[PDB]
Amino acid sequence: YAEDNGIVKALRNVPGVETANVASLNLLQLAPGAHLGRFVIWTEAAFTKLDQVWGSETVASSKVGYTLPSHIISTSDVTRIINSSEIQSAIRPAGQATQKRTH
Amino acid sequence: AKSKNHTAHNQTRKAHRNGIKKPKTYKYPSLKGVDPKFRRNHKHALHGTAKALAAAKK
Amino acid sequence: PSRFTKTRKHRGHVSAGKGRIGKHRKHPGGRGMAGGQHHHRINMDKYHPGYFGKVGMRYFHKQQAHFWKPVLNLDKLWTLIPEDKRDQYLKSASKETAPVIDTLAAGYGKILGKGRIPNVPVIVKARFVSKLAEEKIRAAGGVVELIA
Amino acid sequence: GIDHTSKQHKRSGHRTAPKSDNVYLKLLVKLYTFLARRTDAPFNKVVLKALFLSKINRPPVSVSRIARALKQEGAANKTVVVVGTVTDDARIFEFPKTTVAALRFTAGARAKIVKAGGECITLDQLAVRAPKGQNTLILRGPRNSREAVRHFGMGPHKGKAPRILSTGRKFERARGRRRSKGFKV
Amino acid sequence: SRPQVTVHSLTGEATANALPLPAVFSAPIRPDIVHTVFTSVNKNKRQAYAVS
Amino acid sequence: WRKWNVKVNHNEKRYATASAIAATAVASLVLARGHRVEKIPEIPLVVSTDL
RNA sequence: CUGACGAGUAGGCAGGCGUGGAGGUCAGUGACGAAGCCUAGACCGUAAGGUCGGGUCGAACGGCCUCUAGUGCAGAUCUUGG
RNA sequence: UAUAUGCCGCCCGUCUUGAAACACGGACCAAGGAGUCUAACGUCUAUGCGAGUGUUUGGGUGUAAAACCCAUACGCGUAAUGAAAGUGAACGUAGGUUGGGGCCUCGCAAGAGGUGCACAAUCGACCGAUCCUGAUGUCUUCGGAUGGAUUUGAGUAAGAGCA
RNA sequence: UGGCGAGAGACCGAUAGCGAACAAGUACAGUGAUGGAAAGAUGAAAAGAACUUUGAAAAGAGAGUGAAAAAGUACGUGAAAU
């Protein structure tokens, strides 16, 4: 949520469901056991305030000194980069995947 | 309570574990120890020929 | 890290990596820096030469606040100007609008020369300067103002 | 029983894969093993054996070293490659135009390169642009500039900086450093 | 061109409203930094234990 | 006086929380941790402000 | 796919087996009987060890991904008990 | 798996040049049992930022010993060198030569030419000290310009550090 | 790190944790100053065994209570030495 109006007290009883403000966003809740990906149910105010909290190219930061990090690759798929057009015209042709056993 | 005073057994065998090192001569060895009069002259001779091959070549 | 240390890999080997002949014992060389002019002289000569004796004068009740004099090379001297005004100041490379730089405001006690400020005049305000720095500032056009 | 001359089963002492666990760097290594195996151009084998280098063996290249590399004769249009990072330098004022391609980029470095009109390129976009490594330059930052290599090989008469915590007077300047106190070094 | 996440109502019924992604969802998904930082942060609510 | 609490850099802490928030998107990493999202509408799941 | 090679004490490094506890997961197993114990019964792994069947028993305990340590025994004229 | 048979096989641990030893510990079994934690560091890795870095002494918040956000300094780093007063880094695309991965041009190729980052050797330039040279002026004996030298530093030479 | 009243744990789990989970600064030793133990867990509930027989009695054998006395107050599972 982004603005509390009795939501933490509402869902603090039901087992499993934890609530978290946008400006908190605990790491000990988002990735439990150092495993990525928690099924997070956003609210709309939380989604827009998330844009305000972490920043983008348009809005600046709202965290003093902070910029969202830079990648070191443009696309996580590599086979897309290996295929597309420009590499395969510079590639020597392929041998057989498992070789013939001569002698 | 005497013991072994000296040996050289297993001293020419430890050295040849790592293969007696050739001293790595270089092009332009160091002028440390060369006579200082010639050294001052050759300093200014290199100083002159750098001027001759920097200013005249344009 | 307790499961990653090698004394957990030594469970099963009699001496735990310290040797059977030369048994691991209490303090065989001495406690601390013992024997500096003695059985460890070959370790006080090389890797620590000069550890024994006096060199200088005694300065009773030394205050380091007297010796606060950080230096600023002419290489930076434009990071004191913020980055927004910096491009407006490199352009119009002229007098009557020279950027006033209070070098003491970032805590710099001396302005040293290290090479080639651009040709924009600059009013460096400083406590101390060096001779080859003020010549470069003056050759750029601006002047040095001594403050306190 | 073979009489052996050198070490049996000698591990070569080089790296074959990066020790880091960065997923995207393992993807770049995945891509350049392909390019270094199937393009048979030497540039792909210098990028691959520089991704394997550590942080100390990938020192950062200042953007002023990129300015020196673009003041180099006949190289004003080459797309410079820096395997490693690229840090900003506030000491240069005129910075040239052309392309810089690196793994990482500090914020001042992107600000300066994009401000001068250039384009900061991650290495996969360079592999799209230059598969065989057409028209490039590989720079390296200085390795023997470290605080730790300042102390290596400490011994007498070698002039290599004793490892010391607190300097000034009174701390390793006595007997063994001057003539009047015993010997000098 | 952010992929325009739609907003659901309380009774299901996916509303015609749409919202762009806040550009946090294009951050580098790093399992290793999350792992090491999670270990170092998870050690921070421990109490002291000791023998007498 | 064992070292009980561990310093982390602040920016690396924010890096890890940013990577976690980025991982709460498209649900290979969410279906990996259990999390029965096999029958849902599109992810990230946003519910109206009335909640 | 091809080729070479394989003694090793002190010692160094790597890949791993096991234990007490912690975060996660298998919506794991279980009083139609968990853990434990016995078992010239069986299977797997070079080995650390893992697994199953039978008996005994009486309520809790495991696989995996990581974390942490008061973590592994034939010997110390070792300690306590028998 | 037990036994029979053929051949082989001396009790382990420990010091030790060497022990099955007429060397020492060990009657047996169960349980307990021995390189741990901290302060400051070195080298090597991994991560974040990178001319900077370090949220956590403290403050605001809080689903409250967790998480979250933050000012000002401060620590190390960005400058050395001298006992000290003190001074404090571009003659020159911040150099010259040699060797250099890679890149560019020509060539089918072999190679040739140009460019040569890192690094290795070496000659220079500059900064501090030491020893000399010491001019114009001169609170008329203060002041240092210029030029140096087989001297010297843990220096610079478009920054690599911090956690 | 004392007293009282509180909340907690990536701690120990009865040879561990305080010397002390029990009538623990107790039994006991020493003239004294002082030293100082060991020892928890039947079952849900005593329903902790009426009655017959052998024996002088302890006990046994039947019988019986109990899910089960391969739980009988020398009591949970109950290993190895022997």
Curated annotation (Swiss-Prot), chain B:
Subcellular location: Cytoplasm
Cross-link position per record: Glycyl lysine isopeptide (Lys-Gly) (interchain with G-Cter in ubiquitin): 51
This protein's UniProt keywords: Cytoplasm, Isopeptide bond, Ribonucleoprotein, Ribosomal protein, Ubl conjugation
Residue span of region Disordered: 1-36
Pfam families reported for this sequence: Ribosomal_L29e
GO molecular function, one term: structural constituent of ribosome
Signal peptide limits: none
Gene Ontology biological process terms, A to Z: cytoplasmic translation
Zinc among keywords: no
GO cellular component terms given for this protein: cytoplasm; cytosol; cytosolic large ribosomal subunit
Feature: compositional bias, Basic residues: 1-25
Known function: Component of the ribosome, a large ribonucleoprotein complex responsible for the synthesis of proteins in the cell. The small ribosomal subunit (SSU) binds messenger RNAs (mRNAs) and translates the encoded message by selecting cognate aminoacyl-transfer RNA (tRNA) molecules. The large subunit (LSU) contains the ribosomal catalytic site termed the peptidyl transferase center (PTC), which catalyzes the formation of peptide bonds, thereby polymerizing the amino acids delivered by tRNAs into a polypeptide chain.
UniProt similarity note: Belongs to the eukaryotic ribosomal protein eL29 family.
Subunit structure: Component of the large ribosomal subunit (LSU). Mature yeast ribosomes consist of a small (40S) and a large (60S) subunit. The 40S small subunit contains 1 molecule of ribosomal RNA (18S rRNA) and 33 different proteins (encoded by 57 genes). The large 60S subunit contains 3 rRNA molecules (25S, 5.8S and 5S rRNA) and 46 different proteins (encoded by 81 genes).
Note in the entry: Present with 51100 molecules/cell in log phase SD medium.
The gene coding this protein: RPL29
UniProtKB/Swiss-Prot annotation, chain C:
Location of cross-link Glycyl lysine isopeptide (Lys-Gly) (interchain with G-Cter in ubiquitin): 95
PROSITE patterns: RIBOSOMAL_L15
Subcellular location: Cytoplasm
Cellular-component GO terms for this entry: cytoplasm; cytosol; cytosolic large ribosomal subunit; nucleus
Biased composition (Basic residues): 1-13, 20-29
Positions in coiled-coil regions: none
Pfam families according to UniProt: Ribosomal_L27A (PF00828)
GO molecular function: RNA binding; structural constituent of ribosome
Biological-process GO terms, alphabetical: cytoplasmic translation
Keywords recorded for this protein, A-Z: Cytoplasm, Isopeptide bond, Ribonucleoprotein, Ribosomal protein, Ubl conjugation
Domain of life: Eukaryota
Similarity remark: Belongs to the universal ribosomal protein uL15 family.
The name this protein goes by in its record: Large ribosomal subunit protein uL15
The organism of origin for this protein: Saccharomyces cerevisiae (strain ATCC 204508 / S288c) (Baker's yeast)
Gene for this chain: RPL28
UniProtKB/Swiss-Prot annotation, chain D:
MF annotations from Gene Ontology: RNA binding; structural constituent of ribosome
GO cellular component: cytosol; cytosolic large ribosomal subunit
Ribonucleoprotein recorded as keyword: yes
Main location class: cytoplasm
Family matches, as SUPFAM superfamilies: Ribosomal proteins L15p and L18e
Modified sites of kind N6,N6,N6-trimethyllysine: 49
Pfam families named among the record's database cross-references: Ribosomal_L18 (PF17135)
Annotated InterPro entries: Ribosomal_eL18 (IPR000039), Ribosomal_eL18/eL18-A/B/_CS (IPR021132), Ribosomal_uL15/eL18 (IPR021131), Ribosomal_uL15/eL18_sf (IPR036227)
Coiled coil (UniProt feature): none
Subcellular location: Cytoplasm
Keywords: Cytoplasm, Isopeptide bond, Methylation, Ribonucleoprotein, Ribosomal protein, Ubl conjugation
Crosslink site: Glycyl lysine isopeptide (Lys-Gly) (interchain with G-Cter in ubiquitin): 115
GO biological processes: cytoplasmic translation
Keyword Ubl conjugation: yes
Function of the protein: Component of the ribosome, a large ribonucleoprotein complex responsible for the synthesis of proteins in the cell. The small ribosomal subunit (SSU) binds messenger RNAs (mRNAs) and translates the encoded message by selecting cognate aminoacyl-transfer RNA (tRNA) molecules. The large subunit (LSU) contains the ribosomal catalytic site termed the peptidyl transferase center (PTC), which catalyzes the formation of peptide bonds, thereby polymerizing the amino acids delivered by tRNAs into a polypeptide chain.
UniProt family annotation: Belongs to the eukaryotic ribosomal protein eL18 family.
Note: There are 2 genes for eL18 in yeast.
The protein's name: Large ribosomal subunit protein eL18A
From Swiss-Prot, chain F:
Cysteine pairs bridged by disulfides in the record: none
Posttranslational mods: N-terminally acetylated by acetyltransferase NatA.
Signal peptide: none
Subcellular location, record wording: Cytoplasm; Nucleus
Subunit text: Component of the large ribosomal subunit (LSU). Mature yeast ribosomes consist of a small (40S) and a large (60S) subunit. The 40S small subunit contains 1 molecule of ribosomal RNA (18S rRNA) and 33 different proteins (encoded by 57 genes). The large 60S subunit contains 3 rRNA molecules (25S, 5.8S and 5S rRNA) and 46 different proteins (encoded by 81 genes). uL4 is associated with the polypeptide exit tunnel. uL4 interacts with its chaperone ACL4 and the nuclear import receptor KAP104.
Entry similarity comment: Belongs to the universal ribosomal protein uL4 family.
The protein's role, per its UniProt record: Component of the ribosome, a large ribonucleoprotein complex responsible for the synthesis of proteins in the cell. The small ribosomal subunit (SSU) binds messenger RNAs (mRNAs) and translates the encoded message by selecting cognate aminoacyl-transfer RNA (tRNA) molecules. The large subunit (LSU) contains the ribosomal catalytic site termed the peptidyl transferase center (PTC), which catalyzes the formation of peptide bonds, thereby polymerizing the amino acids delivered by tRNAs into a polypeptide chain.
More about this protein: There are 2 genes for uL4 in yeast.
UniProt protein name: Large ribosomal subunit protein uL4A
Residues of the full protein shown: 106 to 156 of 362
